[PDB]
């Protein structure tokens, strides 16, 4: 992803798939902890939606063309989805969120570097704010799971 | 509309005892999850109160006379109460809220059928709306307990 | 602290029945002043429930087991309930609320004296605050009835 | 076709009911003014809510709502009289009760016509409005020392 | 209630795609009226997201398993997406939304009928409430476009 | 007396003005519907505010306000025509402009008469409403590519 | 006498009216208490607003408001008597009307005096206070079954 | 004396305190005006709260609150002097401090009497009011570069 | 109405410059009282902006052409600006705001008088509201400085 | 501790400062199931402690006292002991530590209640009483989470 | 010393003051279809401009500088040109004027970012970056309304 | 990899705990004209300082660190010094000692910015920059009250 526009568009696809995964987690969750983690998936979705909309409209702003179909989202995203399954444990659900969040953090880091090289300081700030917040969530999720954040 | 009026009053007694059970759960609750489920019982209590007041006033509106004494509630209710017990687990407190809810969901279907058979479309709606919500609570409570809703 | 605990539990019983009586009044009310006094019963029921929840909790906090079934409330309450009746006038309904409140205020005095004698200053403060407020309500209700508070 | 017709009728009758509530609001005198005067405001707002919901359902369905005082006045089954300060509180409220009984009946006819046409959306609008008007009948009737008598 | 379940899942699919289409419209919009219609797409998206969650959740409550991957949304949906294009006119964007919305309303009617037949009154109301609001939107969008609703 | 008379005239004209704004709200079609449709709602709330404040000023002065649709359309100098979807947005807005120009002239007559009779309270009521309707005329006219032409 | 004079007069009279409204609020007994008791709070608050506004207009103008009970009591044209629970609701309201009628008259004087002096700010302050007090008289009188009779 | 008597004495003195705080509010001049002028409003409001509560407790116990400026002025142990713009900020805050010291000692009196009587509700009112007043004394004194010296 | 129009436009010019002067006071202020008076300038400026907007729009409403460039404000306003100076005292800064306010108050009386005679009552009321507030501010600023208002 | 109201107020200032520090440690070092509810709950406990601290300290100043107001003064005068943060502590052990601190605070407040009562400082007395009431309520809820009676 | 950071902040003060005058003119003198949306939209933009002006001016003060604070300094130091108000300018032309002022502000903010980056004034650097980010989004939006790409 | 960023974050945890304790003393011991405004202003300062402490400690936890979490740790690692509370300090002096603290914090935040930039920790770098921006604005205002330029 050799420039700002490219990694912004990659983030548009990855964020769209992350949203979909978070929604599955929300829906298929069963086990002690549902009542706290089910609405928490709403908060994560709303935040993922905020990045999605901000990164897409930064891309538009720069002269680019955001991915904007489910097809383009699936094809371009590096995240893989699987069928919903009620028998997944809470720990496994939260671990899956952590993995998605680690991927997104690493994508925002790439986004940060690329935009830093090109002198696109606005795009740079957008990836940094998003990175900061995702990393904080990794700490909390990991701590729920009895672990160090291990960034 | 004798039957619609009768099931409305049945609900008044059952909602009164359901309220009393939820208060017992809320008070005698002990175990991991207390801090989430104790205030959650207040929320369920507020919603129950809401049905009670609405169904009771629908009864008065139709020229009936709501049950309005603890004796009437207890005698007329199909719900049975037991002495408060601190030694009940959280899981089993929750499962008992589920049984009460499954009861109410059934009663509200009866109320729906009866009112639909009498062409009391207003009472019909009241039962439907209340049924919709209790059923959603049944899904969530069951999810916490690692089970399907099994309506 | 057996006596403090005992009177807290008496209040749980009496407040549950007081709430049931106010609800009756609220529903069976008819006559000029209905539009102001019907919603006013909601306000009183809300205050009563606040007292109910705070006193039971304090009892739980003290190592006790509050009454938590309709039977327990009805058997232990000194208050008596009669079938709802639409023919009772507005002023009769108010007078019956005054009686209930007069009983609650006297009960809360006994709560105050007993906890004071036992040195349970937290419980003592709870009765005092509840008593202040009920007595204010006696004044207002009597004033509507054209009478002195007559505490 | 007929559900369109009951929706338009409601438009006419809600516009007249609003004018009547406003009269009661203005001409009211006697014990209870302070509570019943602003109550007529809450009534007019709820009435206005129905009116706007129903004309818009009519437009949505391809209709042409009444939208002139002549159309309202001529198509409504409710009659107005000149404002009179001398009416008692109890009679004002009884007048409102009667307006409300009429609207509860019209909302019923509304429910039945759309139910037969299978206009389920219009069916629900009539059901929701009927529910609230009947609750109001209970309370007004209660103020007046009477049973609801629907 | 197999057909109610199956119609809820179809909605899940079509709402997910309708949301994607509204998002594309939001992003790719150019021309007089942008300032009003661009944020208006967000309102519609929120409303769509509401149906999505209520419907998906009702399916779960009924013992179903909702589509929860982009692949499932894309392949089960009757709606079809095209690549984003800035050169479309405002008027063409709005008509595109009208067509998506006409589809949704008809889909909701199917859901209402199927659920009425099975006696699942709860799902029945959900479709009816959603149908009402989408129809209201069709009126407004058509009005902006100088046409009657033509339901 | 003249103040009473013009307050009453306003009650009738504001009632009819409210009916016309509603029709414009409902029958509007064309580019700009999405901004002007809810905007008619704001105009109607403002008109209702004047309606109820002038009417209550009249009652307060010992008068008896018009309070039936009959009285409203008999006393109002505004003309209502049937609702017509094929009217243009710019034509609907020009129609609101006329009604407002009329109301603003009426509120001037109310200002004048109340000032001559010594009724400073009623005088402010007219002045406040005139200020606001005229502000609205500027904006409407500016949307139409025109000067206020007050 | 002059703008400063009638503002200071209003200061003394508002302080005394405040005190009287407090009396009614406290000794009220009879059907209607539950509505009229808190209504007296609304009136007192409104009175305090006039009070504050007029004193500080007096200070702004170079004057020196009465700021002792001796001053309010000796300069006020209103008369206080001892509280009494045996006064009925009907009678309590009548006294409030009397106070408000006095205040409306005071405010007319303030209007005429400030208008002749060209002090338009004070003029507005008196006009706004009067407008509100007169509305309250209509409502109070209407609870009492009477016309406002300004 | 008894709880009823000191409550009524509190009614007297709070009324007068309020009158004095109003004077400080109005007549204030000097550096710090902008912070201290609205601060007097906060204090007045808090004083009004004690007044209303203590008065209604009196009524509730079956007493009869002072309710005329005459009774307030006579029964209060606080002395009023004429408003004067020439007092310093430091002198103004000193006057307020002495009113508060007085009130806090009165509330101690009410506390002591009510405790002996066993009227625990009245006791609480006095204790709550005393708590807040003494906190105000600390802050006032600190602004003045002094210890609270209660 | 040519004179009402001329005084509204004078006010547009004088308010623009008064705003500029208040911003200077806000920025360059030093000395005891900064913490209260610094944010107070903001309140004054927001008040000044409100008059600016209302008077300019009344002029538009009347058929006029408001000054709308820095050159026009500066050449038309009777108020003179000097360069920012940190060394001015708090008491000197407040005195300056007093003199600006005295001018505005006089300008608003002049606006009242011309509009009162010209029959334009709307413009008249705007000047009167604004004069009322500015005069109260004069009282308060003067009191701060230990002086009578001296209007 | 022990002389008068002024002295127990100041003992509270010191013990509340340390209690705050312990809760912050629990908030930070917390790991395990329940983190998502109990991590933010620590913030609530901390806000409430801070409210006692301020109110008590300011009551002291109001009485003519000089509150402790350095870390050294807090840590030397307080009966609470702090240990180094440790992530391996279980959640149930974390909550059990909060209960101990709260049990200590309740006992401190009862002593403050008594002392101030003995001197007739009734304003101070109510401060201690209000604070004790809510801490005891928290001991109830915390213990309940831990499957225990409050055991005051 | 940050000489050039201070100087670009002052250039921003003068340019923001003039930008504010121009949006106000567009606001007052606007006529044509879209008035009802774009007239209040100018108020939003003006508020945003005033925020930048106040932040950039108070950063400059904070650094020991001396902000422009008279109309004369604003008009003489600003690179932006004002012309007389004219009701006969179309909507599209007004929006174009705004787009032009915004292109300029974004180029000035870019210069502010670059200069402060070089002098190690990271705080000033973030102020210019935040303002730029937002101005650029508006240019996208305004251009879209005009049927154009943003062409940053 | 991030050792130096971790160490400065933790330094800030200690310094901010001490800064909070000093603002508290200033809040409590303050006397003289301007008390009514500067007393509550310390609460605003205290809440802002708590926000940095919490965010910086959690950033430390997030990177794999172990934040200081005891008064002893705060006292021993902080470079700030505390003295006994004293009512006879003047307002200007109290205000000057807050400025001293804020100058220290601003320089700590600059160091943290620098170290985190050097290690490529852009998230940490931003936290210090935001904190610095705000602390420096307060120095400006406090100095202005004291009749001085900011002197950063
Ligand atoms: Ca499982
Ligand atoms: Ca684990
Ligand atoms: Ca009866
Ligand atoms: Ca195009
Ligand atoms: Ca004269
Ligand atoms: Ca100097
Ligand atoms: Ca362990
Ligand atoms: Ca157990
Ligand atoms: Cl358990
Ligand atoms: Cl013109
Ligand atoms: Cl002087
Ligand atoms: Co967007
Ligand atoms: Co009810
Ligand atoms: Co509870
Ligand atoms: Co509408
Ligand atoms: Co959901
Ligand atoms: Co009205
Ligand atoms: Co004042
Ligand atoms: Co009261
Ligand atoms: Co404007
Ligand atoms: Co404090
Ligand atoms: Co500023
Ligand atoms: Co935290």
SS3 per-residue string spanning D17-31 = HHHHHHHHHHHCCCC
Widest Cα–Cα separation across chain B: 48
Dihedrals φ, ψ of A61, to 5°?
Answer: -60, -35
C117 is in an annotated binding site: no
Q: Report the separation in Å between the CA atom of I27 and the middle of ligand 22, taken as the mean of its atom positions.
A: 7
Burial class (CB in 10 A: 0-12, 13-18, 19+), L60: buried
CA of L116 to the centre of ligand 22 (A): 31
Say yes or no for a CB contact (<8 Å) between H147 and J64: yes
Angle of helix E90-118 versus helix E121-144 axis, rounded to 10: 160
**Cα–Cα distance measured from residue B98 to residue B94, given in angstroms and rounded to the nearest whole number:** 6
Residue with tokens 């903001």: I42
DSSP chain B: -HHHHHHHHHHHHHHHHHHHHHHHHHHH--STTHHHHHHHHHHHHHHHHHHHHHHHHHHHHTT-----SHHHHHHH-S-------TTS-HHHHHHHHHHHHHHHHHHHHHHHHHHHHHT-HHHHHHHHHHHHHHHHHHHHHHHHTT-----
Interval between CA G26 and ligand 19 midpoint (Å): 7
Contact of J140 with C60, CB cutoff 8 Å: yes
Reading the block at residue B107, the tokens are 């009663």
In the reported structure, the alpha carbon of residue I64 is separated from the centroid of ligand 10 by a whole-number distance in angstroms of: 7
CB-based contact, K137 to chain E, within 8 Å: no
Q: Do the beta carbons of residue L7 and residue L65 sit within 8 Å?
A: no
Nearest-Å Rg of the Cα atoms of chain F is: 16
Compute the distance from residue C42 Cα to the ligand 13 centre, in Å.
7
Phi/psi at G64 (5° precision):
-145, 95
Query: Are residues D139 and C35, on separate chains, in Cβ contact within 8 Å?
Result: yes
Cα–Cα nearest to C108, from C136, C85, C129: C129
Is J126 labelled as part of a ligand binding site?
no
DSSP D72-122: HHHH-S-------TTS-HHHHHHHHHHHHHHHHHHHHHHHHHHHHHT-HHH
The vertex-D23 CA angle with D22 and D26, nearest 5°, equals: 85
Nearest by Cα to G57 from G117, G6, G109: G6
Residues of chain L positioned with their CB less than 8 A from the CB of I34 = 141, 144-145
The answer to whether residue K87 neighbours chain F at the CB level (below 8 Å) is yes
Q: How far is CA G3 from CA D69, F18, G71, H52, I143, in A?
A: 49, 42, 18, 34, 21
DSSP character at residue H42: H
Query: How far is the alpha carbon of E84 from chain D, nearest alpha carbon, in Å?
Result: 31
For residue E79, CA distances in Å to A16, A23, E104, G70 come to 18, 21, 10, 83
Does D32 contact chain C (CB < 8 Å)?
Answer: yes
J to A contact (≥3 Cβ pairs closer than 8 Å): yes
Q: Are J70 and L84 in contact (CB under 8 A)?
A: yes
Contacts of C102 (CB under 8 A, 6+ apart): C138
Distance between G97 CA and the closest CA of chain I, angstroms: 30
- Residues G114 and G120 sit within 8 Å (Cβ to Cβ): yes
Ligand closest to Cα of K24 equals 20
Provide Rg for chain I, Cα atoms. 16
Chains J vs F: touching, with 3+ CB pairs under 8 Å? no
3-state secondary structure labels for all residues of J18-41: HHHHHHHHHHHHCCCCCHHHHHHH
**Chain K nearest-CA residue for I18:** K70
K145 with E36: Cβ contact below 8 A: no
Residues of J in contact with L58 (CB under 8 A): 28
Domain boundaries, chain C: 1-151
Using CA atoms, how far apart are residues E86 and H53, in angstroms rounded to an integer?
68
Nearest to L92 by CA among L14, L6, L30: L30
**Per-residue DSSP letters for E58-107?**
HHHHTT-----SHHHHHHH-S-------TTS-HHHHHHHHHHHHHHHHHH
As a dihedral over the C-alpha atoms of residue I14, residue I17, residue I22, residue I23, rounded to 10 degrees, the angle is 150
Give the architecture (CATH level 2) of G1-150: Up-down Bundle (1.20)
- Measured in Å, residue C27 CA sits from the centre of ligand 13 at 7
Nearest-neighbour CA in chain E from B68: distance (Å): 30
Q: How many CB atoms lie within 10 A of CB I34?
A: 19
The answer to whether the CB atoms of B140 and A29 lie below 8 A apart is no
- Residue of A122, A125, A126, A127 to mutate for K, most K C-beta atoms under 10 A: A122
Which residues does chain I have within 8 Å of residue F148's beta carbon, measured at their own beta carbons?
60-63
Is residue J100 within a helix (H) or strand (E), and if so which, with residue range?
Answer: helix J91-119
Give the residue from chain H lying closest to I145, CA to CA: H30
> Which chain B residue's Cα is nearest to C16?
B70
- When scoring F11, F13, F26, F63 by the number of chain D Cβ atoms within 10 A, the one with the most, hence best to mutate, is F26
Please indicate whether, in this complex, the C-beta atoms of C32 and D35 are within 8 angstroms of each other: no
Ligand 15 centre distance from Cα of residue F25 (Å): 7
Q: Any idea which residue has 């609220």 for tokens?
A: C26
Contact I62 F150 (CB under 8 A): yes
* Angle ∠(F101,F106,F112) on CA atoms, nearest 5: 130
What is the distance in A from the centroid of ligand 6 to the CA of C151?
A: 66
Other chains touching J, judged by 3 or more CB pairs under 8 Å: A, B, C, H, L
Interface test with A, best of K129, K133, K145 (most A CBs within 10 A): K133
Query: Residue I17 in contact with residue I81, Cβ under 8 Å?
Result: yes
Whose CA is closest to L100, among L120, L80, L73? L80
Say whether L65 sits in a helix, a strand or coil. coil
Q: Which helix (H) or strand (E) holds J145?
A: helix J122-145
Do the chains contact at G26 and H56, CB–CB below 8 Å?
yes
C121–J contact, CB cutoff 8 A: yes
Q: Decide which of 3.50.50.60, 1.10.287.3510, 3.40.50.1370, 1.20.1260.10 is the CATH code for A1-151.
A: 1.20.1260.10
Task: Return the half-sphere exposure (C-beta side, CA atoms, 13 A cut-off) of residue H99.
Answer: 30
L135 CB contacts (<8 Å, ≥6 apart)? L102, L105, L106, L109
* Number of continuous H segments (helices) and E segments (strands) in chain C: 5, 0
Q: Do K31 and F139 touch (CB under 8 A)?
A: no
* Ligand 13 center from residue C52 Cα (angstroms): 19
Binding-site annotation: residue ranges of B:
26, 53, 57
For residue F80, what is the nearest residue in chain D, using CA coordinates? D68
Q: Are F60 and F111 contacting, i.e. CB atoms less than 8 angstroms apart?
A: no
Secondary structure class of D57 (helix, strand, coil): helix
E20 close to K135: Cβ distance less than 8 angstroms: no
Residues of C in contact with J137 (CB under 8 A): 57, 61
E77: left (phi over 0), alpha (psi -120 to 50) or beta: beta
Mutate which of F55, F119, F120 to disrupt the G interface (most G C-beta within 10 Å)? F120
The conformation of residue F78, written as its DSSP 8-state character, comes to: P
The conformation of residue F80, written as its DSSP 8-state character, comes to P
| CA A57 – ligand 16 centroid, Å | 27
Q: Mark out the alpha helices in chain H (DSSP H runs).
A: 3-27, 33-60, 69-75, 89-117, 120-143
Residue I47, token pair as written in the block: 């008040």
Indicate the SS3 state at residue E93: helix
H to L contact (≥3 Cβ pairs closer than 8 Å): yes
Would you state the CATH architecture of domain J1-152?
Up-down Bundle (1.20)
- Cα–Cα–Cα angle for I94, I97, I103, rounded to 5 degrees: 145
∠ Cα E76 E82 E86 (to 5°): 145
> What is the nearest CA distance from E146 to chain F, expressed in angstroms?
4
Q: Which chains touch G (3 or more CB pairs under 8 A)?
A: C, D, F, H, I
Q: Which residue has the tokens 């100088």?
A: E146
Neighbours of I119 (CB within 10 A): 13
E86 to chain B, closest Cα gap in Å: 42
Determine contact: J141 vs chain C, CB below 8 A.
no
I98 in Cβ contact with I141 (< 8 Å): yes
Q: CA dist G113 to E27, G64, G100, G125, J22, Å?
A: 65, 18, 20, 13, 70
Does B150 touch chain A if contact means CB atoms closer than 8 Å?
no
Question: How far does the centroid of ligand 22 lie from the alpha carbon of residue I80, in Å?
Answer: 22
Distance CA G120, CA G111 (A): 9
User: Count of CB atoms within 10 A of residue C102's CB?
Assistant: 17
Q: In degrees rounded to 5, what are phi and psi of residue J65?
A: -95, 180
Give the distance from residue F134's alpha carbon to the nearest chain G alpha carbon, in angstroms: 22
The three-class DSSP label of residue K63 is: coil
């Amino acid at each position: 992803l050799a420039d700002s526009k490219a990694v912004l568009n990659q983030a548009v696809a990855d964020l769209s798939v992350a949203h979909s995964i978070l929604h599955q987690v929300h829906w298929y969750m069963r086990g002690r902890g549902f009542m706290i983690w089910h609405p928490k998936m709403d908060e994560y979705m709303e935040e993922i939606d905020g990045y999605l909309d901000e990164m897409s409209e930064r891309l538009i702003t720069l002269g680019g063309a955001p991915f904007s179909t489910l097809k383009e989202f699936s094809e371009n995203s590096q995240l893989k989805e699987v069928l919903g399954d009620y028998n997944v444990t809470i720990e496994e659900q939260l671990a899956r969120v952590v993995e998605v969040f680690r991927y997104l953090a690493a994508l925002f880091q790439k986004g940060f570097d690329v935009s830093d090289e090109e002198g696109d300081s606005v795009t740079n700030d957008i990836f940094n704010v998003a990175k900061a917040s995702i990393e904080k969530h990794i700490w909390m999720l990991q701590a729920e799971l009895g672990q160090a954040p291990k960034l």
